[PDB]
Design a binder for this molecule. Structure first.
Ligand SMILES: NC1=N[C@]23CC[C@H](NC(=O)c4cccc(Cl)c4)C[C@@H]2[C@@H](COC3)S1
Length: 389
């Protein structure tokens, strides 16, 4: 029904990530922690860094436990390195519980703590199979569910503002809700539709059809999920496999062709600005992603507006102009439905029943002519064929 104490517990924005307040150690040390469904490690800055206003101090925690194991976590656009341990951990605006949980204490990093992003750690909410160094390292949400009576389910309402937020504003604004252990009915409208989690590693789903303004992209559906499709709040953009990305950009280009933009716009590098309030939303197409249903030969679709895929940024100069970057980009690791897609929907991570549910978000950005949508059913065949092996 309602989990009031948890509503409004998030802050941030798609460009810097959305975070939750957590406490670690005895006495409690307060940190802001990235909410990240595309990884499985609870990891927190543990030594001074130019971009950390605070950090985990283990010697000040009487409940700290040293696991005496190192962990090294490199990805393409950055990396972190640190020391494993356990401690006591709470979420002040979450359920009224304290659990013992694995903490990776981060001792060295690169391009990980971004300047004035406001978070000091990351909460990987995906399954043990992609935890580092191996799956024996129990992810925070598993610890929580084993140690308390909190149901095996969480739900995310990420709220994009629709315009830029300065650092004072980003700190003062409510950025959404993470409901731990439940579904809050005031965070969405219309029905929740559910798609099966294909495999408990990332939050993996299957896309069976893509449309731009109703026009079927008409690729073999295996391309849409090559080599996987995941829901991932720790990534900004909607990321698409090279072949899908090329065909989608061609289609979006065609549909918006009454204005032409620099190639740097479509590559997500440079911004485009219009005079205050004149953004031509209507020239940009909607994007529908059809997902596999729970019922045999039944799918459903989530529909997003350019208000989701054009990400609001502050102008290079100083103007009153409304400026945006193109928040769809190329991926070599399969489809990634990031913050900008998730901002359109209430997303229910139903671990217990091995499914993800989507509903129109009560805080999604729209205009008077269109809104985001979650609709079904559609009769679709050979949907298993869309998955990659
Ligand atoms: N899901 C993933 N998590 C990882 C840690 C978090 C990283 N994101 C950010 O710092 C970030 C920055 C700005 C906006 C947003 Cl939304 C996120 C991305 C990493 C990639 C490799 O795995 C680890 S993908």
């Amino acid at each position: 029904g309602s989990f009031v104490e948890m509503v409004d517990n998030l802050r941030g924005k798609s460009g810097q990530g959305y975070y939750v307040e957590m406490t670690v150690g005895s006495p409690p040390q307060t940190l802001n922690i990235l909410v990240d469904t595309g990884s499985s490690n609870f990891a927190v800055g543990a030594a001074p860094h130019p971009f950390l206003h605070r950090y985990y101090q283990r010697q000040l925690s009487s409940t700290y436990r040293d696991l005496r194991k190192g962990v090294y976590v490199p990805y393409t656009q950055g990396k972190w390195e640190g020391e494993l341990g356990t401690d006591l951990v709470s979420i002040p605006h979450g359920p009224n519980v304290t659990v013992r949980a694995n903490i990776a204490a981060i001792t060295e990093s690169d391009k990980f703590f971004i300047n004035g992003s406001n978070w000091e750690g990351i909460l990987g909410l995906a399954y043990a199979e992609i935890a580092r160094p191996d799956d024996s390292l129990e992810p925070f949400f598993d610890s929580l569910v084993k140690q308390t009576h909190v149901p095996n389910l969480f739900s995310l309402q990420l709220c994009g503002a629709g315009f830029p937020l300065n650092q004072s504003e980003v700190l003062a604004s409510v950025g959404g809700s993470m409901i731990i252990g439940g579904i809050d009915h005031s965070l969405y409208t219309g029905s929740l539709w559910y798609t099966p989690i294909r495999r408990e590693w990332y939050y993996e789903v299957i896309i069976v059809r893509v449309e731009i303004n109703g026009q079927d992209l008409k690729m073999d559906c295996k391309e849409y999920n090559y080599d996987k499709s995941i829901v991932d709040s720790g990534t900004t953009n909607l990321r698409l496999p090279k072949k899908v990305f090329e065909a989608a950009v061609k289609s979006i280009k065609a549909a918006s062709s009454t204005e032409k933009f620099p190639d740097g716009f479509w590559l997500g590098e440079q911004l485009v600005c219009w005079q205050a309030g004149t953004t031509p939303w209507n020239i940009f197409p909607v994007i529908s992603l059809y997902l596999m249903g729970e019922v045999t030969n039944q799918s459903f679709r989530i529909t997003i507006l350019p208000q989701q895929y054009l990400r609001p940024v502050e102008d290079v100069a100083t103007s009153q102009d409304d400026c945006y970057k193109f928040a769809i980009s190329q991926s070599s690791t399969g489809t990634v439905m990031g913050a900008v897609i998730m901002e359109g929907f209430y997303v229910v991570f139903d671990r217990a029943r091995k499914r993800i549910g989507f509903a129109v978000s009560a805080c999604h950005v729209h205009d008077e002519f269109r809104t985001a949508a979650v609709e079904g059913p559609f009769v679709t065949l050979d949907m298993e064929d869309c998955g990659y092996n």
